[PDB]
Design an enzyme around this catalytic site. Sequence first.
Site, short mmCIF file in Angstrom:
data_model
loop_
_atom_site.label_atom_id
_atom_site.label_comp_id
_atom_site.label_asym_id
_atom_site.label_seq_id
_atom_site.Cartn_x
_atom_site.Cartn_y
_atom_site.Cartn_z
N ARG A 63 0.82 -1.20 0.00
CA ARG A 63 0.00 0.00 0.00
C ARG A 63 0.84 1.23 0.00
O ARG A 63 0.42 2.28 -0.46
CB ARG A 63 -0.89 -0.05 1.22
CG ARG A 63 -1.88 -1.20 1.08
CD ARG A 63 -3.32 -0.71 0.98
NE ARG A 63 -3.61 0.02 2.21
CZ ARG A 63 -3.81 -0.52 3.41
NH1 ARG A 63 -3.79 -1.84 3.58
NH2 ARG A 63 -4.04 0.27 4.46
N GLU A 100 3.15 -7.80 16.55
CA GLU A 100 2.41 -8.05 17.79
C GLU A 100 2.65 -9.45 18.31
O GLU A 100 2.90 -9.65 19.50
CB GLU A 100 0.92 -7.83 17.56
CG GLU A 100 0.11 -7.84 18.85
CD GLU A 100 -1.33 -7.42 18.61
OE1 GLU A 100 -1.82 -7.60 17.47
OE2 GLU A 100 -1.97 -6.92 19.56
#
Lengths: 178, 178
Positions: A63, A100
Amino acid sequence: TAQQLKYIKDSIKTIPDYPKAGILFRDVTSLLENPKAYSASIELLSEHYSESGVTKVVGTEARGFLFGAPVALALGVGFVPVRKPGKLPRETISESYELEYGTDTLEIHTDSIQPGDKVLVVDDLLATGGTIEATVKLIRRLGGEVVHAAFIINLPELGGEARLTQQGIHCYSLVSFD
Amino acid sequence: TAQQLKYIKDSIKTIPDYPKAGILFRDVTSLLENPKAYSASIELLSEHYSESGVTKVVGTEARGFLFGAPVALALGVGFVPVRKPGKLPRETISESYELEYGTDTLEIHTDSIQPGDKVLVVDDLLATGGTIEATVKLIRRLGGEVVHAAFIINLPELGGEARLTQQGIHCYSLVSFD
Ligand SMILES: Nc1ncnc2[nH]cnc12
Ligand SMILES: Nc1ncnc2[nH]cnc12
Ligand code: NA
Ligand code: NA
């Protein structure tokens, strides 16, 4: 510029509760499909740096490509992609970044950056800043100078801006949300 | 246009024996980092369709983004991304395509294409044509019309061009190799 900025921000849809619930997802695809908002966002990013001396633009896949590569074209400079591993074919170096629940790596072509390069990093959205910190280190390891990172969207409460500051990056964002 | 085309083709590096051996990999990153070759490639793709009546451009992630989205900007039309699953946040439909050792799926936003759309699909390189065939079906299922698909590089011997022909797609490529 305030009229333009407002129109860009409005073109971005918010999807409530995606992926998880409570989270408000800021979706840039609604901007991509609005030709006036999309060209306005590239015009403003490239104007802002039009005499910063940029010699290269770097974007992180996928992106980041959508905003990095048009900015490069508008500045008239080379675009250099940072990719997940196993996609670039020439000599790369690599940097890892904690996610994470695990770690990932990003790579860059060693030939695409040299001492003296002034490099702008462009991405769609700044959240935690982890990919961009790894990107910066990649560029600095090839002798490249990066002082600025540009984004369509800043989500300051996720701390990426603060985080990039500690690494000595000036972050410029067109818009921001919480 | 022949001078321009030649300069584009020359800007593309060939990496012998990547990934596997014997294979000659055609690497478009060397083009991305050459500002004259990169802007020339976008100029020629967008010129070629400058009055084809295109209302949308579709590119498949990630390397398709690098040529699709600038063509859209140059044509002044919306860009619509086709992604691997779990990346688009609004309502999608999905199409599967056989890969060499398995199957994968591509998705598109159902809202981003409507009846009447004239859609150009742009990708970096045409090899086997499998992603592009799935992309086409996605666009046609939302009422969109696609007659043309554009590429920087055609590798005809891998059969994608032939394959897209059977689906009624006119393929336009700037360059080709074996
Ligand atoms: N709210 C959000 N919208 C889009 N991308 C994100 N990444 C992390 N949080 C996000
Ligand atoms: N030779 C080649 N170069 C680049 N991409 C490819 N995909 C399949 N074959 C290829
Ligand atoms: Na170097
Ligand atoms: Na639709």
